[PDB]
Design a binder for this molecule. Structure first.
Ligand code: NA
Lengths: 101, 102
């Protein structure tokens, strides 16, 4: 149950500081409604993992590095999943929250 | 200790776990728009005349003893607790409280 508080300028691009340990693999998600029993929507799916989610709005500026238009997401919470192994069977989640300058 | 992630059932009262260290005094605030340069609105202070005044239409603050909220993110801004060792709150650190919903 870790939290990552970061600061950026509202409505401007912000390269999100990845709070996963170094050399961990990370996947970025929206947790719908910030409800833990709700779906985790994966962001920045290149193709195909199985479902690609595209955003109507401008939340995502870039997927490399993961860069957002500095704002709190309304659909749910911004969560990063950290895993040492590529299969992601053992992992930990960190929620990312913004203070605005 | 800058962020405190907590879990509750949405739209039901939640006694907020105070994340200040033990023996510290705590005051609860909304930071308007979560903007560091914006006003801090103190909760559980309800004493008057002023051109801008803040009301709680949805009973976001359920109780001030213990500090208990309607389990929700306040739209006006972020929930912040100011922790101070001294009663004068001259030396302090703020902790933002964030909710995951059950
Ligand atoms: Na929320």
């Amino acid at each position: 149950q870790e939290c990552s508080l970061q600061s950026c300028t509202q409505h401007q691009p912000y390269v999100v500081d990845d709070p996963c340990p170094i050399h961990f693999y990370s996947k970025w998600y929206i947790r719908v409604g910030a409800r833990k029993s709700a779906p985790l929507i994966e962001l920045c799916v290149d193709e195909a993992s199985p479902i690609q989610y595209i955003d109507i709005g401008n939340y995502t500026v870039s997927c490399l590095p993961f860069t957002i238009n500095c704002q709190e997401p309304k659909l749910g919470s911004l969560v990063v999943r950290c895993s040492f192994y590529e299969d992601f069977l053992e992992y930990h989640d960190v929620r990312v929250v913004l203070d605005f300058i």
